[PDB]
């Protein structure tokens, strides 16, 4: 067959898109307790009853959480059981034998979800599939209770019967392709822009100022983001696994919290710096010797190091629940789990304290402007646009992540994992935007003009 190409059309890839890999017991659309990939633990309303059924199926005390290895085996046990039920049942097998392999998955998909006896209930609909009345059965199936409870999944199945193609499922794969090239472009902009900013200030003596020294610390944190944090995050998400061992992912996690904390705090430092330099240019200039601007950045990185490496390498961030323990003991799993104390403590230091200081700073900059020795002119509006981009971009990139992060602490299961990852990557791209915001100055544009060889 020689088909090792991506999205082979088959039942296994069909159901995984529909059900999804969840390693903890969860309640499905109907309300029943489900684990793994659509594995129905029990029809009982007691989580305790579902656990013992799970423990009987697995053979150990799962505590409600199974490994990815075990979840795969239940799925295959569930798929083959659905295949056996079709071959055993007298209504399904005549329909099943007369179906091409693509529409066989759609029938097995139904039997997977609703069972042998439940799917055999479609007296007219199954009879239409024998007679190859696809569109006519498609309209028939859309009227079922199965359609009302899960309209989205039924559409994919009903369309799959109707066309005999994987059009309902093949489109999902473009997402992984488009996500990869988007994740790719993000790495380029962060590495290119930040190296370009670092190189300009270091090579050109005109740019070696105090405010730019703060820019340099910002550019270094954003650089390591694009070099270290972001590339492995793309590799982690696309391949669905971690391939570098436990130690390196805590060390990767350690760099992630390190750079983001240092980057955001430096934005806060730059904000206050410009407040002082704009509202008291002369007193401020007396203050900052080269040693202070050096010790300030030192504090930012010491504070950032204490938030990132010290809790993570000392296992203080470690969560205590069973699903965290397994991912901690699994070499290939590096999902992010933390106790409530670290999540709150890190969020305040990394984001909330800088946010409050930043918001207050630019407010007073805009507040100081009106009480000066002086009629709705342009540059006052033009200046207000500039800070709106600065604070607006910072806010819109990171405020969803750390709100959702804190919301995840207060109430569990409210944040699905995809939203949590998406917003972090929307936070990741602030590193690419920071050179575009803070390096608009005339001396930068000249330095970039010569660094790019005109």
């Amino acid at each position: 067959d020689a088909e090792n190409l991506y999205f082979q059309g088959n039942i296994f890839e069909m159901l995984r898109i529909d059900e999804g890999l969840r390693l903890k017991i969860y309640k499905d659309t109907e309300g029943y307790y489900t684990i793994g990939i659509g594995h129905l633990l029990t029809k009982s309303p007691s989580l305790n009853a579902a656990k013992s059924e799970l423990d009987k199926a697995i053979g150990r005390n799962t505590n409600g959480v199974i490994t990815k290895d075990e979840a795969e085996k239940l799925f295959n046990q569930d798929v083959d059981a659905a295949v056996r039920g079709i071959l055993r049942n007298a209504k399904l097998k005549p329909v099943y034998d007369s179906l091409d392999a693509v529409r066989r998955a759609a029938l097995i998909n139904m039997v997977f979800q609703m069972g042998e006896t439940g799917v055999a209930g479609f007296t007219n609909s199954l009879r239409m599939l024998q007679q190859k009345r696809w569109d006519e059965a498609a309209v028939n199936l859309a009227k079922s209770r199965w359609y009302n409870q899960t309209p989205n999944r039924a559409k994919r199945v009903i369309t799959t019967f109707r066309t005999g193609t994987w059009d309902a499922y093949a489109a999902d794969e473009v997402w992984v392709v488009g996500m990869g090239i988007v994740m790719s472009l993000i790495v380029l902009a962060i590495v290119f822009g930040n190296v370009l900013v670092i190189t300009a200030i270091a090579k050109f003596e005109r740019l070696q100022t105090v405010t730019n020294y703060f820019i340099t610390s910002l550019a270094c944190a954003d650089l390591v983001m694009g070099l270290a944090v972001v590339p492995f995050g793309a590799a982690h998400i696309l391949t669905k696994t971690w391939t570098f061992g436990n130690f390196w992912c805590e060390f990767w996690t350690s760099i992630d919290v390190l750079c983001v904390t240092a980057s955001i705090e430096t934005l806060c430092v730059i904000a206050v710096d410009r407040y002082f330099a704009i509202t008291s240019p002369f007193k401020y200039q007396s203050l900052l010797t080269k040693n202070k601007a050096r010790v300030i950045i030192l504090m930012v990185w010491i504070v950032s190091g204490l938030t990132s490496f010290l809790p993570i390498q000392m296992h203080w961030y470690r969560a205590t629940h069973q699903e965290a323990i397994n991912c901690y003991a699994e070499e290939t799993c590096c999902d992010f789990f933390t106790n409530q104390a670290y999540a709150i403590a890190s969020s305040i230091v990394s984001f909330y304290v800088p946010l409050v200081i930043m918001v207050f700073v630019y407010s007073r900059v805009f507040q100081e402007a009106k009480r000066q020795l002086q009629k709705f002119a342009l540059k006052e509006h033009k200046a207000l646009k500039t800070l709106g981009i600065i604070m607006g971009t910072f806010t819109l990139c990171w405020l969803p992540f750390f709100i959702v992060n804190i919301v995840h602490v207060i109430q569990d299961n409210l944040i699905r994992k995809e939203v949590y990852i998406l917003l972090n990557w929307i936070g990741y791209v602030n590193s690419g935007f920071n050179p575009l915001i803070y390096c608009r100055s005339p001396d930068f544009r000249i330095a970039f003009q010569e660094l790019l060889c005109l």
Partner: nanobody
Amino acid sequence: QVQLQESGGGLVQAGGSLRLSCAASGSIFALNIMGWYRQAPGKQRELVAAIHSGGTTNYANSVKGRFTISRDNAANTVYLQMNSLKPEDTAVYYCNVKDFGAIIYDYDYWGQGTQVTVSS
């Protein structure tokens, strides 16, 4: 789109007094610095006297106690009062405007230029 109009360039004897006046046109952000820079022959441009929009000033050490900077109350006009002029004070005084409209970087405006001559 902004203008700087420099006035008061003078020939004067040593110890005499000069007054330099700068006026600005267009639209300038409220948070700004207007100052005076001089460049001596074969020397680098240096700060002489500066005033912030809020009234805070700054003077070079060589001109402290001798030069006084003042500002118009509402017309973006700056006056440099130079007294006890020394022959070392012989340079060309440039009207400056430091502009904070773009928050991250200060953006300068420069004046035309006026000659000050002190005769020993």
